[PDB]
Design a protein around this ligand. Structure first.
Ligand SMILES: [Mg+2]
Ligand SMILES: [Mg+2]
Ligand SMILES: [Mg+2]
Ligand SMILES: [Mg+2]
Ligand SMILES: [Mg+2]
Ligand SMILES: [Mg+2]
Ligand SMILES: [Mg+2]
Ligand SMILES: [Mg+2]
Ligand SMILES: [Mg+2]
Ligand SMILES: [Mg+2]
Ligand SMILES: [Mg+2]
Ligand SMILES: [Mg+2]
Ligand SMILES: [Mg+2]
Ligand SMILES: [Mg+2]
Ligand SMILES: [Mg+2]
Length: 66
RNA sequence: UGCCCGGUGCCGGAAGGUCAAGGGGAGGGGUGCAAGCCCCGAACCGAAGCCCCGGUGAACGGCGGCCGUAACUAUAACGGU
């Protein structure tokens, strides 16, 4: 339970980031794949379905073999 | 060589409360023709001791429980009761 979190959370510093919610530019960016929407209000309201799907397609495009 | 004098001990306290013998003798009783003789007996005065008020530990002794809370988990300096 402990070592697993240190893979997920880690140091929690400004780096190590998975997603930026920069209110100035109304942007939510998943830096690990490059998908960025611009509905920072709807995303924060709970419409995270596109970000999960856009990671889902790049999730099996982690299984591209030979 | 710390904190606790509520209990026990000891020390201090001419007040107060309780308290024996004794003092007191309201008012009762027995007996006698009577004068009397004989018993009972309220209030009230009346020590120490105990009660009561303090002090006292190198006097007898005694020195808690539960719940919550911090940049990973853990822990809890902190808080509540
Ligand atoms: Mg004591
Ligand atoms: Mg005392
Ligand atoms: Mg004492
Ligand atoms: Mg006593
Ligand atoms: Mg004394
Ligand atoms: Mg008498
Ligand atoms: Mg007399
Ligand atoms: Mg008369
Ligand atoms: Mg007569
Ligand atoms: Mg006395
Ligand atoms: Mg006392
Ligand atoms: Mg001592
Ligand atoms: Mg003892
Ligand atoms: Mg004791
Ligand atoms: Mg914690």
């Amino acid at each position: 339970l402990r070592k697993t979190r240190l893979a997920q959370i880690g140091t929690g510093e400004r780096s190590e980031k998975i997603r930026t919610y920069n209110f100035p530019q109304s942007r939510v960016t998943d830096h690990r794949i490059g998908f960025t929407t611009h509905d920072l209000e709807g995303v924060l309201s709970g419409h995270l379905t596109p970000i999960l799907e856009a990671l889902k397609r790049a999730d099996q495009e982690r299984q591209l073999a030979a």
